Structures are given as structure tokens and as C-alpha cells.
């Protein structure tokens, strides 16, 4: 990932979205878009996107549904043009394996959400945790999600993971997590509000990466 | 809602999901649209469903991020014309309570899913799911949905949010649970396939309501 950051495009004006995401273009090579861009303007945002950006796109969909349903979410996001998509593994190994099969079908990736950045997330989901990243190695998933806010997790996420699978990390920045704690154990973070309410989008990210480099 | 019986209408199609609508809709009150669905058509068919119909609209969005997205989602639904929207527990509190913030500021509800239907729900949500329903009494909802599929498990969430929360249920027909049964416990039952997939869509929906009266 360029810059090892991902933007998150969570603006859910078009062209608010366009003209943040175009300001910052030269520091990211991924957009993570998800239910607030296209629940207001529609999956078409996403081709539109990869094209005008030429980035790559995940779909931030937290799929957490029965596996037929989870197919289905699958398969509209994939032909929308989205490079992957984020699966909660909360649902269990029958939903994460039904997005992994259309992945598989349409030449794209699936991420696994196993701990979630948010306080709230203490209460059920940081008590599966493990058991769900142990569920994804088992199911053959090589790209993770882990937060940012529990530096502590995330490295026992990567502990569990190893380390040739791929770990982004929100949850820096407004969520209160640090750019470089967090690559000690991700490789890429992801960041929205920091960058998209910033005054300068452009001069937030450029100081991101000054950071990033400075590791 | 009308005779106890809610249409999951996860067609894809606009043409088809309309169709079929439109021929059970002597027999149901209410129209449960998810993701398949809108991410095919787009989110104005929520407006088209609710006119043309005159039905309620639950939006199935198992709504499962942080707070701060989950209100953006949230308020995306309801200005679409969604009368409810279906939230996750597992992510907690929180994460709830941001649902429930922007339902109160625009007049809408939120159901509370608390044990979903499918196999794989018994790997990580079983375990959690009574805590979890009794957290949302806690934070003062009063819709729920849990699995047909598990009256047992029905009966014990019944039994933590007592007779006066609505409950609705999944996983009838397709995924192998029973109206009759599943009506004990529950006020509603949602069924997809079972209506949609059948060559004629509106003789499942009276059989399945012949069943309910029978009760
Ligand atoms: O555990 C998770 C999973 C995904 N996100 C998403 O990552 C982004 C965080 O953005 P921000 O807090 O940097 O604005 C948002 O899109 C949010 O929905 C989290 O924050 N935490
Ligand atoms: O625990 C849950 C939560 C929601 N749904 C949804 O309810 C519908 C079930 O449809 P069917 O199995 O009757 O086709 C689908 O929209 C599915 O996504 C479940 O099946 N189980």
C-alpha cells in the first residue's frame, strides 16, 4: 500500500468524497470506501473511483451475515469494482467461507475483521478475537483487520496471523491510536477523519507519511 | 404486522424483486429490504418499495461498525425511507446506542439482532447472545430478531426481554425452521426464499399464512 496508508473515504457528499480523495491522491495507492459513501450515493461511486483515482478500492462492508446472504453482498460488491472486501468473523467459519468461495470465483480478496477499534468492542468481540484469527488462518485468509487503538492486540493478532499475512489497522488519529505504534505490528493503517476533516487533507496526510517514513 | 408474516425480499433484480412484491402483498404489512437488494439497485428502492406498496420497510443492514459510522449509516437509511433498521449487538454498547441516538432524532426504530439463524452462529454469537440481549433491555430497545432455526434459543431470549418487546424471527423455510413453532416465541416471521423462490410466490405466502391462523 502506498505510503503504508489507506484513506477512508467516510464524506457522504460526492463531491466532497472526489475532492478529498483527488487532494491526497499522490500520498495513498488504496481508498477504503464503505456504507456511508455508498448508502447516500450509490456502489456506481466505486468504479467511478478506481478509475478517476486509479486506486484500489475495499469495501468496508463488515459482512456479518447468513453465508447465502454473505454471497450475495459479495458478488454486488465485486461487480462494482471493489478489489476487496472487509468480513467480520463474529458470524463464524460457514460466513467467512461463503465470501471467501466468491473471492475466489471473481479474482478478488477477502479481509477478516477479528477486533474491532471501538471501546464497545470489549464487551464481546475482544474475547473471540483469537479465536476468530485462528478461525481465518484455518480458513487459509491472509489479509486481517485488527485495531490500532489496542496496540497490545494487534500485536497478538499478528502473533496468530504471522507474518506473511497482510494486517491494516484503523483506528489512528480521531480513534486516539498512533501512526508508528501501530506499524510495528500492521502494515498498513488506515485513516479517515484525521485526513478528511482536516483543513488540509493534503498537508494531514503528507504528515502522516513524514512519520510513517521516520520509522 | 399483517398476519404475522414479513417478506425478506433479497432478489436482486429491481424487475423481479417488484414482481414478487407486488404478488404477496395481500398477505404481508411489512418488507424486510437488505444489502442483495440495494447494493443491486441502489437505495431510492426503498422510496419505490414503501409508495408503490404502501409496506413498512425494515432495513436488514445487521448494522456493525463504530459508533460514529454506525449513526452515519443509520441516518443514510431512514432519510432513504427506512421505517426500521436491524443492528448487530456482538460490536456493543456503543455501537448500539449510536443506532438508537439517530432512530430517537428521526422517528425510526431499531431491532436488535441478538442470535442469528445460521450454523455457524454457534461458534461465537450463542455463547454471547443472552448477554446481549440483555444489554439492549438495558439500553432501552424494544424490537429484537432471533433464530428460528433455534426455538429453544428463541424461548430464552423471549424470556429476557419479556411480552412486551417485539420479537421477529429468521430463518423459516429455507434454513429449515417451522412458522408454527417459531411463532411460540416470536410475533413475526421473516421468509425469503421459501416466498420468492417458489413458482408462485403468493400460494407459499397463503399456505404459510394457513399455517399461522391455524395457530
Ligand atoms: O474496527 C474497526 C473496523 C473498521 N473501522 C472503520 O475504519 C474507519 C476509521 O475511520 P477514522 O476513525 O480514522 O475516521 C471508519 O471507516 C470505520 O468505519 C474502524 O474504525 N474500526
Ligand atoms: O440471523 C439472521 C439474520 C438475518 N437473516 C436474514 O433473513 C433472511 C432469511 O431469508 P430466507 O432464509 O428465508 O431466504 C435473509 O435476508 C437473511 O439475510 C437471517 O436469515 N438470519
Redesign the pocket.
Same mark, same amino acid.
Given at each position: 500500500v502506498m505510503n503504508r496508508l489507506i484513506l477512508?473515504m467516510?464524506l457522504m457528499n460526492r463531491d466532497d468524497a472526489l475532492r478529498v480523495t483527488g487532494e491526497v491522491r499522490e500520498y495513498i495507492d488504496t481508498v477504503?470506501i #464503505?456504507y456511508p459513501l455508498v448508502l447516500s450515493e450509490g456502489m456506481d461511486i466505486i468504479a467511478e473511483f478506481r478509475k478517476r483515482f486509479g486506486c484500489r478500492i475495499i469495501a468496508?462492508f463488515?459482512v456479518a451475515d447468513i453465508p447465502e446472504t454473505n454471497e450475495k453482498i459479495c458478488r454486488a460488491t465485486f461487480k462494482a469494482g471493489a478489489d476487496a472486501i472487509?468480513v467480520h468473523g463474529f458470524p463464524g467459519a460457514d460466513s467467512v467461507r461463503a465470501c471467501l468461495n466468491v473471492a475466489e470465483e471473481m479474482g478478488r480478496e477477502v479481509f477478516l475483521?477479528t477486533?474491532?477499534?471501538?471501546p464497545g468492542?470489549e464487551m464481546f468481540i475482544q474475547g473471540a478475537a483469537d479465536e476468530i484469527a485462528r478461525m481465518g488462518v484455518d480458513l487459509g485468509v491472509k489479509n486481517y483487520?485488527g $485495531?490500532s487503538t489496542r496496540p497490545e492486540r494487534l500485536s497478538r493478532l499478528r502473533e496468530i496471523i504471522g507474518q506473511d499475512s497482510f494486517l491494516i489497522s $484503523? #483506528?489512528? #488519529?480521531?480513534?486516539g491510536g498512533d501512526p508508528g505504534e501501530t506499524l510495528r505490528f500492521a502494515d498498513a493503517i488506515?485513516? #479517515?477523519?484525521?485526513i478528511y476533516l482536516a483543513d488540509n487533507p493534503a498537508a494531514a496526510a503528507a504528515g502522516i507519511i513524514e512519520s510513517i517514513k521516520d520509522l
Open positions: 477512508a467516510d477504503k #464503505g468496508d463488515k472487509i475483521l477486533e474491532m477499534s471501538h468492542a483487520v $485495531p $484503523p #483506528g489512528v #488519529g480521531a480513534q488506515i485513516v #479517515g477523519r484525521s
